[PDB]
Amino acid sequence: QPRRKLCILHRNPGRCYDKIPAFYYNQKKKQCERFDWSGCGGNSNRFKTIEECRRTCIG
C-alpha cells in the first residue's frame, strides 16, 4: 500500500482551537486530502503540503 505505516492512520484534527490547513493520506481513496489540524493532538498522518504527503505515502 502506502510507503509508510503512518499513512494508514485515521485522520485526526486533535483537540485545540486553531484551524491549520494540512494534508493526510486517505488509505481508502488512495489520495492525499485536505483537513484542518487544530494545533495540538492528532497523529503523524499529517503533512504541511500536498507534495510532502505525495512523496511520503505515494511516491
Short mmCIF file of N, CA, C and O in Angstrom, two decimals:
data_model
loop_
_atom_site.label_atom_id
_atom_site.label_comp_id
_atom_site.label_asym_id
_atom_site.label_seq_id
_atom_site.Cartn_x
_atom_site.Cartn_y
_atom_site.Cartn_z
N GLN A 1 0.85 -1.25 0.00
CA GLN A 1 0.00 0.00 0.00
C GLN A 1 0.86 1.26 0.00
O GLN A 1 1.73 1.43 -0.90
N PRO A 2 0.54 2.19 0.92
CA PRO A 2 1.30 3.45 1.04
C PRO A 2 2.71 3.04 1.48
O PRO A 2 2.86 1.92 1.96
N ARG A 3 3.66 3.94 1.25
CA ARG A 3 5.04 3.71 1.55
C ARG A 3 5.33 3.61 3.02
O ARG A 3 6.36 2.91 3.37
N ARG A 4 4.62 4.32 3.87
CA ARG A 4 4.94 4.26 5.31
C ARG A 4 3.70 3.84 6.07
O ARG A 4 2.60 4.15 5.64
N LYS A 5 3.95 3.37 7.29
CA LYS A 5 2.84 2.92 8.14
C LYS A 5 2.03 4.09 8.72
O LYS A 5 0.85 3.97 9.02
N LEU A 6 2.62 5.26 8.87
CA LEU A 6 1.89 6.44 9.35
C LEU A 6 0.80 6.83 8.38
O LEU A 6 -0.10 7.54 8.73
N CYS A 7 0.87 6.49 7.15
CA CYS A 7 -0.05 6.79 6.08
C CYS A 7 -1.40 6.13 6.25
O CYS A 7 -2.40 6.56 5.65
N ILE A 8 -1.45 5.03 7.00
CA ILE A 8 -2.71 4.34 7.27
C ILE A 8 -3.48 4.92 8.42
O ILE A 8 -4.66 4.53 8.66
N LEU A 9 -2.88 5.77 9.23
CA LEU A 9 -3.61 6.30 10.38
C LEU A 9 -4.81 7.10 9.91
O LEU A 9 -4.76 7.74 8.84
N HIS A 10 -5.88 6.96 10.72
CA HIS A 10 -7.13 7.67 10.51
C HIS A 10 -6.85 9.15 10.76
O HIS A 10 -6.10 9.56 11.71
N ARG A 11 -7.42 9.95 9.92
CA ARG A 11 -7.26 11.42 10.03
C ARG A 11 -7.69 11.92 11.42
O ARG A 11 -8.85 11.67 11.75
N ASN A 12 -6.96 12.81 12.04
CA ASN A 12 -7.33 13.34 13.35
C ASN A 12 -6.83 14.78 13.51
O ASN A 12 -5.64 15.06 13.49
N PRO A 13 -7.82 15.68 13.68
CA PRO A 13 -7.56 17.09 13.91
C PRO A 13 -7.02 17.37 15.25
O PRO A 13 -6.46 18.47 15.34
N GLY A 14 -7.22 16.54 16.26
CA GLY A 14 -6.66 16.95 17.61
C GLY A 14 -7.80 17.71 18.33
O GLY A 14 -8.90 17.81 17.84
N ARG A 15 -7.42 18.31 19.49
CA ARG A 15 -8.47 18.91 20.34
C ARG A 15 -8.33 20.38 20.61
O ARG A 15 -9.02 21.03 21.51
N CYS A 16 -7.47 21.07 19.88
CA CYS A 16 -7.23 22.51 20.04
C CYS A 16 -8.19 23.35 19.21
O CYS A 16 -9.09 22.81 18.56
N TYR A 17 -7.99 24.66 19.27
CA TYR A 17 -8.93 25.57 18.60
C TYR A 17 -8.41 26.25 17.37
O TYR A 17 -9.18 27.05 16.78
N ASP A 18 -7.24 25.93 16.91
CA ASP A 18 -6.69 26.53 15.64
C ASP A 18 -7.33 25.82 14.46
O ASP A 18 -8.11 24.83 14.70
N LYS A 19 -7.01 26.25 13.26
CA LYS A 19 -7.53 25.52 12.02
C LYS A 19 -6.38 25.67 10.99
O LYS A 19 -6.30 26.72 10.32
N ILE A 20 -5.41 24.77 11.06
CA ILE A 20 -4.21 24.83 10.23
C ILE A 20 -4.41 23.93 9.02
O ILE A 20 -4.74 22.74 9.17
N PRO A 21 -4.34 24.51 7.85
CA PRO A 21 -4.64 23.71 6.58
C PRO A 21 -3.49 22.73 6.40
O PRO A 21 -2.30 23.10 6.49
N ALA A 22 -3.81 21.47 6.25
CA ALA A 22 -2.85 20.39 6.10
C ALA A 22 -3.47 19.29 5.24
O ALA A 22 -4.61 19.31 4.79
N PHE A 23 -2.61 18.30 5.00
CA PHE A 23 -2.95 17.12 4.23
C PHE A 23 -2.70 15.85 5.04
O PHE A 23 -1.84 15.77 6.02
N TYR A 24 -3.42 14.83 4.72
CA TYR A 24 -3.16 13.48 5.31
C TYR A 24 -3.41 12.52 4.16
O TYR A 24 -4.25 12.90 3.26
N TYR A 25 -2.94 11.35 4.22
CA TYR A 25 -3.20 10.30 3.28
C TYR A 25 -4.46 9.52 3.62
O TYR A 25 -4.58 8.96 4.74
N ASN A 26 -5.40 9.45 2.75
CA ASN A 26 -6.62 8.71 2.81
C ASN A 26 -6.44 7.35 2.12
O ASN A 26 -6.50 7.16 0.88
N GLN A 27 -6.22 6.39 2.98
CA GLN A 27 -5.94 4.95 2.59
C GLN A 27 -7.07 4.44 1.75
O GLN A 27 -6.88 3.78 0.74
N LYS A 28 -8.30 4.66 2.18
CA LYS A 28 -9.48 4.13 1.45
C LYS A 28 -9.61 4.63 0.02
O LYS A 28 -10.10 3.86 -0.86
N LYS A 29 -9.28 5.90 -0.25
CA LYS A 29 -9.44 6.58 -1.53
C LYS A 29 -8.11 6.59 -2.31
O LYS A 29 -8.07 6.97 -3.50
N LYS A 30 -7.04 6.30 -1.60
CA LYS A 30 -5.70 6.29 -2.16
C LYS A 30 -5.23 7.63 -2.63
O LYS A 30 -4.54 7.83 -3.65
N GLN A 31 -5.50 8.64 -1.82
CA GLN A 31 -5.07 10.01 -2.18
C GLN A 31 -4.84 10.84 -0.94
O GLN A 31 -5.44 10.60 0.10
N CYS A 32 -4.08 11.87 -1.15
CA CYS A 32 -3.88 12.92 -0.14
C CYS A 32 -5.04 13.90 -0.22
O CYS A 32 -5.52 14.28 -1.30
N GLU A 33 -5.52 14.25 1.00
CA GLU A 33 -6.67 15.13 1.10
C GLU A 33 -6.38 16.18 2.15
O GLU A 33 -5.51 16.00 2.98
N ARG A 34 -7.13 17.24 2.09
CA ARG A 34 -7.07 18.38 2.94
C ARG A 34 -7.85 18.02 4.25
O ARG A 34 -8.87 17.39 4.14
N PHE A 35 -7.39 18.67 5.25
CA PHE A 35 -8.08 18.71 6.59
C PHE A 35 -7.40 19.91 7.28
O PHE A 35 -6.40 20.40 6.73
N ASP A 36 -7.97 20.44 8.30
CA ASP A 36 -7.58 21.42 9.24
C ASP A 36 -7.14 20.70 10.55
O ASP A 36 -7.91 19.96 11.15
N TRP A 37 -5.92 20.90 10.83
CA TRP A 37 -5.23 20.46 12.03
C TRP A 37 -5.44 21.59 13.09
O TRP A 37 -5.21 22.75 12.74
N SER A 38 -5.85 21.16 14.26
CA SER A 38 -6.24 22.03 15.34
C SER A 38 -5.12 22.68 16.05
O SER A 38 -5.43 23.58 16.90
N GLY A 39 -3.91 22.31 15.85
CA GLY A 39 -2.83 23.00 16.62
C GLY A 39 -2.32 22.13 17.74
O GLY A 39 -1.26 22.54 18.28
N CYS A 40 -2.90 21.00 18.09
CA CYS A 40 -2.35 20.08 19.12
C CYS A 40 -3.10 18.78 18.90
O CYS A 40 -4.14 18.77 18.24
N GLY A 41 -2.50 17.71 19.48
CA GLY A 41 -3.26 16.40 19.28
C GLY A 41 -2.95 15.90 17.86
O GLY A 41 -2.03 16.37 17.17
N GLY A 42 -3.80 14.96 17.45
CA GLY A 42 -3.61 14.42 16.05
C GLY A 42 -2.68 13.21 16.10
O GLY A 42 -2.41 12.66 17.19
N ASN A 43 -2.23 12.80 14.94
CA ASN A 43 -1.31 11.62 14.80
C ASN A 43 -0.39 12.02 13.65
O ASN A 43 -0.54 13.17 13.19
N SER A 44 0.52 11.23 13.22
CA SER A 44 1.54 11.58 12.25
C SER A 44 1.14 11.46 10.79
O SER A 44 2.07 11.71 9.95
N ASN A 45 -0.04 11.09 10.50
CA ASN A 45 -0.60 11.15 9.16
C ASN A 45 -1.03 12.63 8.96
O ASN A 45 -2.22 12.86 9.01
N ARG A 46 -0.09 13.53 8.81
CA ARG A 46 -0.47 14.99 8.63
C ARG A 46 0.71 15.61 7.90
O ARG A 46 1.88 15.35 8.37
N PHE A 47 0.45 16.35 6.88
CA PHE A 47 1.61 16.97 6.09
C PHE A 47 1.30 18.42 5.90
O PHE A 47 0.09 18.74 5.66
N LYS A 48 2.33 19.27 5.81
CA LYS A 48 2.08 20.71 5.55
C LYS A 48 1.70 21.02 4.09
O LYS A 48 0.98 21.98 3.88
N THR A 49 2.17 20.27 3.13
CA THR A 49 1.96 20.43 1.70
C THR A 49 1.54 19.14 1.06
O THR A 49 1.83 18.03 1.57
N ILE A 50 0.84 19.21 -0.04
CA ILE A 50 0.41 18.03 -0.79
C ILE A 50 1.63 17.29 -1.34
O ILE A 50 1.53 16.04 -1.44
N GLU A 51 2.71 18.03 -1.68
CA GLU A 51 3.92 17.43 -2.22
C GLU A 51 4.58 16.48 -1.22
O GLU A 51 4.92 15.38 -1.59
N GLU A 52 4.72 16.87 0.00
CA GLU A 52 5.13 16.17 1.13
C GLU A 52 4.27 14.95 1.39
O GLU A 52 4.84 13.86 1.64
N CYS A 53 2.97 15.09 1.34
CA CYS A 53 2.08 13.89 1.51
C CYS A 53 2.35 12.85 0.44
O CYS A 53 2.49 11.58 0.67
N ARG A 54 2.34 13.34 -0.84
CA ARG A 54 2.56 12.51 -2.00
C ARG A 54 3.86 11.77 -1.97
O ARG A 54 3.87 10.53 -2.16
N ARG A 55 4.99 12.40 -1.80
CA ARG A 55 6.27 11.71 -1.70
C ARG A 55 6.37 10.65 -0.63
O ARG A 55 7.01 9.57 -0.79
N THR A 56 5.91 10.96 0.59
CA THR A 56 5.91 10.17 1.79
C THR A 56 5.04 8.91 1.70
O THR A 56 5.53 7.81 2.08
N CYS A 57 3.85 9.02 1.24
CA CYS A 57 2.88 7.96 1.21
C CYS A 57 2.61 7.33 -0.14
O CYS A 57 2.11 6.19 -0.19
N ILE A 58 2.80 8.07 -1.23
CA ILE A 58 2.53 7.63 -2.56
C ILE A 58 3.82 7.36 -3.35
O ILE A 58 4.01 6.23 -3.82
N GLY A 59 4.68 8.32 -3.39
CA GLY A 59 5.94 8.45 -4.08
C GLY A 59 5.80 9.47 -5.22
O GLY A 59 6.10 9.05 -6.37
#
